[PDB]
Amino acid sequence: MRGIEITITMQSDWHVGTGMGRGELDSVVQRDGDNLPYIPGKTLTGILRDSCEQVALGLDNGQTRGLWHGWINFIFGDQPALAQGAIEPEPRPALIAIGSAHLDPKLKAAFQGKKQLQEAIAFMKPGVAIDAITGTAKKDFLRFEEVVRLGAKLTAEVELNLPDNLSETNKKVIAGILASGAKLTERLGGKRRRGNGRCELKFSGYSDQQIQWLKDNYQSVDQPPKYQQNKLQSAGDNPEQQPPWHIIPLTIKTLSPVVLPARTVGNVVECLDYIPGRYLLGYIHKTLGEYFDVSQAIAAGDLIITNATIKIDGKAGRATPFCLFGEKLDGGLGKGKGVYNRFQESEPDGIQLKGERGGYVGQFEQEQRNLPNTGKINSELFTHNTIQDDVQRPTSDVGGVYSYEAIIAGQTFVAELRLPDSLVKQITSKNKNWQAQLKATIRIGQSKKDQYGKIEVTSGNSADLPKPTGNNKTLSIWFLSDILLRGDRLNFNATPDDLKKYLENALDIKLKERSDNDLICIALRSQRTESWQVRWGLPRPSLVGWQAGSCLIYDIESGTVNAEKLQELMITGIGDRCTEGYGQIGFNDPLLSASLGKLTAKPSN
Amino acid sequence: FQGFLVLIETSGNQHFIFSTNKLRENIGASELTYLATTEILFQGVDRVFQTNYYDQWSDTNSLNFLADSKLNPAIDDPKNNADIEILLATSGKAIALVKEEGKAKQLIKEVTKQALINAPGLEIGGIYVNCNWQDKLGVAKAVKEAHKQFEVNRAKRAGANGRFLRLPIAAGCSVSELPASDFDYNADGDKIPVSTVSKVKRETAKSAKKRLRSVDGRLVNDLAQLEKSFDELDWLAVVHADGNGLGQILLSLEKYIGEQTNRNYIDKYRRLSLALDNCTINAFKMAIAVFKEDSKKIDLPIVPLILGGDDLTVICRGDYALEFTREFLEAFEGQTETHDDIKVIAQKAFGVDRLSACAGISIIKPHFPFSVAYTLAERLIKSAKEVKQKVTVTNSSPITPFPCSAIDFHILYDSSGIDFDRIREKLRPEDNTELYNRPYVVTAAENLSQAQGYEWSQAHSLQTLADRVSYLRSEDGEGKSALPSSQSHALRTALYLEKNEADAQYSLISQRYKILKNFAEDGENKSLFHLENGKYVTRFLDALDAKDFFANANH
Amino acid sequence: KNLYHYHQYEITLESAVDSCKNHLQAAIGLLYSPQKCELVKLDNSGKLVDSYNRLKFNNLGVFEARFFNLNCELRWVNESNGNGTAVLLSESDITLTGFEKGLQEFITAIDQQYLLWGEPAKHPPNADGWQRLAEARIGKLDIPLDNPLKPKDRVFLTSEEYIAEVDDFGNCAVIDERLIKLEVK
Amino acid sequence: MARKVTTRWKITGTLIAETPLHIGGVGTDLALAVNGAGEYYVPGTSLAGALRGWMTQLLNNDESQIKDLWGDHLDAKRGASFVIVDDAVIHIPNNADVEIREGVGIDRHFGTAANGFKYSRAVIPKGSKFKLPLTFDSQDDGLPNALIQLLCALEAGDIRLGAAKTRGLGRIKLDDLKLKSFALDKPEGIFSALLDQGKKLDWNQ
């Protein structure tokens, strides 16, 4: 149940803070991707949660734990970070997703291009401490806070993912609580107790009728129902996979910031610069799981969803090859000059080189005579707190504040769903328009219920399959995705001779290292992936391998390389967990074959 | 006579030292990195060669013991027979010469195995190359080959990521991405699960106060009070500094040693390395005069993580990092001027007695990821090193950089970006305009006058920023600020406008607040921008941001 | 000093367990399925009470398994349709039908610990030889442990990392880690 | 749970300027505090410090009693204020506007206007009204003495607000004081908070 909104009307000047100032300002407000003030969904949940907990205390007659407090842990989810000891039940998620509150889209459209007005939405408020003895302004306690002008009407998208078996009376309890907690909210943001942030918070379609029903009925409520996961189901009735493959392009646009955990390290989560294919799996289940047994396809390898990487040249951006090197002072792909492919080019006389690492490159062809276009993903650090409820402040800076990197909104990513003709025939027989069903707005990743994760997915016309050139002189390999390989003891591993063995087995050839000294043959980096498994309820095993961008080139020592088999590997991937986009590989790519040292990059309402 | 050159080197110092935001572990990881190529090397050398390098070091508590080759035998003298000579030991690198291939390999096994046992998560490797001592420059050739072959292995080496792997039923570390392995305490005192990696770092933080005791007794004494104090500060800084010119020397050192004999290369190489450690630590003692002294605070608000040679890496209080690094870089140049072990090589390389260093400074909230902050300090020092292209020795062929210290910094305000390219892109409101004028040259205008790019260095002089910050901080005769915050903020807004709108606003405000004439940059006294390489650039936004970060305390 | 490893191919999980059962006696298993990560214990004979149904692949079934006891560890991962590679690790030289023996020299092995999720639950499960840890973060975790957990006990999975030369230059690494047993500390 | 509140007190009335008033804003002394609508207002930070300042003089700087009402960022037991002070728009009466006070220092030797000592100040005129905009969260079944003393001081006109307190300005008096009680510990009081506008207290008692 998305389509509920909260409206916040700001009735006094207001300050969602950033925990810091800037320059001449001692406190600055949070601004969205349009540089406009907004209330983050994490702030909005926290204020609304706090007020439903005020209502719960009254209904529980001051009992801090009880029936009605359990209803808050039902509606808003448990708070496992605060619980200690052997809590046996799995932590309940929220039933309510609350978005960020933004200004009306036409008003934000008017602000586009008008940087002076964008600043004018806020003004400086002075603050000064007075010496209690001398009664004078205590200098260096003079302070300027940015506050946003009152009158702002902000609106957040709300989704109530109520349990599908939930009793109609319990529906009215949830509606009653939320209406009641919304009503009791009077303040949000910084300096609430000194008159900032006075507001009205109203749900669409919750009124005093929902309040009055609870007042009439609260004495005969009970505990909310127990939480259980939606389990997978499998029929096993899928047809065996048959070629051809179909490649269905998926365009992902970020609509909110999206947190895609690279590493979780104390109170900070770092974010990837791509969307892993595993985040789209729940969308694949939801949209297509009625047309074939998705879980069976995953187990058999009849499904691949690639990583969504930044769109470059209208296609998925490809992780910068580690065989590319910049001139350390004046070159590199960021400087658009002095980029050497050390698979093909000697290191220049007297010039030291830095290896390329991050970023993505566009398309390239053997005689392009321009460096490939680079793509960059914009990430921002978002900072949040927990309030200790008795003191109504964070319990310290060290353990009161936490941060997420997120991919910011407005960025575009391309994934590919690959399905064999076997399943595509089955799907098309059940629904001819099935590609129309791939258009969806979904929330993905960490903290997806709050201010994070909102993405639009769009499906494109079936892409052409990869057509690698079969060359019998050399094999070139570009890791478009992290490659996870088992060692021969099935631990995960970092031994490239195992990948050499894997390829020459998979292609039925023999490979030899490129023996020149002025050139490099191998350019790998290690990668460790520390994910969760939400259905497990437990962490995923740590997956080790090679990061995207890792490159290697071999002489073929014997045997013809089958262009049809190279194409199939370029579709299915190599190694482990290719279904979710690991193992994606580029064979004999012209960019790894080029000499590039002489090339340069191309130039309101 | 013939032998092998062993290079043993630690890599991934970022991913080891900054992989947690816990000060004891940053401190502890930095100690393990230092110990890995000293104590663990010397204990390994003692085990492999039946020597007493560890006794000589631990009695001296310094690396100078290996200078005088009656004590660190000159094994190219056959009468002073020994299997081993140490050429270099320093943080993250060591070099040794050995006459036997087996003991070369055995040394690498010994030192690398001990890091696995005593320093879990440390990425250390080694390599050996042949050393043709009958060839003059044979050592210089061996050094070059060992280094470049080391890189080719790191492009294939199995990483440290493969060992402490998460099992779905293992709990996680409180402070890192690894599974928990045992328990420690947070600063509050609460028992917390930690990794083997985190546990061993914390254990080794107890060792750092011993190392730093010889530097300054004010540096570390109560890690818990220090760690608690840091996370009560508004700002930390990750300060990273690298020597300029040292790489330009070590690319070519046999050109500058004088006599081309291996004995002279080694002797000159070792003293150059040791003297720059001495210069580093002495320049540090001078620079820490910048930090004010709190009687309550037993310790200075600075943590020297790496402190020798080219590399200085410190975490300190962030409003004192700009002055500390200026004073460090100034003190470092003066030190290198005054070591004869450096003078003659810097003279022959660059025509001046001094070397210099660039620095990158990431100024961050205490909760900001030190991993990310250090990555930015790397990109800032890479930006600071652009002096190498702009400031050059006249009539040098090939063009050579002329010893010029520089700083690049960032203060990580909330929406400022967190990666270097995004940070700077956000400061380009139009493609003709840059709201930054970086890097800032720290070398004195007098010492640059013979360089190419002297006029460039003065436009990029740090003093120009410090003056503008002084004007922002200065007061009128009322004791009100000479520029109010309201006007400073209007100028911040104006800088994002079209240049004619920005210059129009600057005209209006400077009519009213005449101190802004000193912030003009066009020389026509009518713009905050000046044209630079076809871009309009300004120092003004740097001054507004850096306003509170020039604290000093050395007046 | 050798770490012996034994490898079989195109083998189903339940067959791999049975083919190893004389060594996996009382082993803790950790089974990986799309919906569940579950601990199991083999009988002192090495069987599992629903073995076929428990180790079946075809219905959201087991794609990976690890069985470990004091002497050895079996690892299995699905290659196709529920058939896959088994590797058994043992520091003892042992005979297996069908498994190809190999070995690795290792210089030394060092003890490691992993803290398990949770504190001892307020009551153990009704099954004998099972205990319940719980943490608000994950809820319950039933573990096949026969010691009745004291309040403020913590359980650690103990392991041994084997260190060997990876390079002809003499660079060491830990080449593998074998899981041993649950231990209460 | 939230912060445990026994009774929430909405404490309201009309504060009248008994002298002119000046509360300054960032943008000599001709800038009066204006909200985002550009209306003149009393910032709740400035009213709180007036009220907190008075109580501090009352309680002989007994910091503990002050921090128990007004909060403390330092003490691990305290945190947020239990008094909320809202911002209050100033209603300047009809046919009135902001005035400007012009003045000068007088040289003590010559008895004449000292050169460089002219000053100008904008002032909200006398008789201007703004709301007393207070909320108090009680954690016990009463109302604090020092808070009752504060309300008596406000009704007495004893509290000064804004600049130039010693030199003409800042006197305010409270009228129409109303106290509304919400027993947020109890269902009847929470639903009263949601629906019924609260249990009236006679202040005169």
Numbering used by the authors:
A (entry chain A): 1 to 603, 615 to 616
B (entry chain C): -1 to 553
C (entry chain B): 9 to 193
D (entry chain D): 1 to 27, 32 to 209
Question: Can you quote the paper on this entry?
Answer:
Native mass-spectrometry revealed that a single copy of each subunit assembled into a 332 kDa complex, in contrast to type III-A and -B complexes which contain multiple copies of Cas7 and Cas11 subunits. An uncharacterized domain comprising the N-terminal 112 residues of the Cas7-insertion subunit was absent from our map, likely due to flexibility. Csx19, a subunit unique to type III-D1 and III-Dv, contains multiple β-sheets and is nestled at the base of the effector between Cas5 and Cas10 subunits, making contacts with the crRNA, and contributing to the structural integrity of the complex. Indeed, affinity purification of a ΔCsx19 complex with an N-terminal Cas10 tag did not result in pulldown of the complex, indicating that assembly of Csx19 onto the type III-Dv complex is essential for complex assembly and stability. Our structure supports this evolutionary relationship, as the organization of the type III-D1 operon is maintained and subunits are physically fused together through flexible ~20-residue linker polypeptides. This is exemplified by the Cas7-Cas5-Cas11 subunit, which adopts a tortuous topology that places Cas7 in the body of the complex, Cas5 below it, and Cas11 back on top of Cas7. While most of the crRNA spacer is completely buried within the type III-Dv complex, six bases at the 3′ end are highly exposed in the insertion domain of the Cas7-insertion subunit.
CRISPR-Cas are adaptive immune systems in bacteria and archaea that utilize CRISPR RNA-guided surveillance complexes to target complementary RNA or DNA for destruction. Recently, a variant type III-D system (III-Dv) was annotated with multiple gene fusions, suggesting its role as an evolutionary intermediate between the multi- and single-subunit type III effectors. The operon of the type III-Dv complex from Synechocystis sp. PCC6803 contains cas10, a cas7-cas5-cas11 fusion, a double cas7 fusion (cas7-2x), csx19, and an insertion-containing cas7 (cas7-insertion). Here, we present cryo-electron microscopy (cryo-EM) structures of the type III-Dv complex in four distinct states: bound to a crRNA (binary, surveillance complex), bound to an RNA non-self target in a pre-cleavage state, and bound to a self-target with coordinated magnesium in pre-cleavage and post-cleavage states.
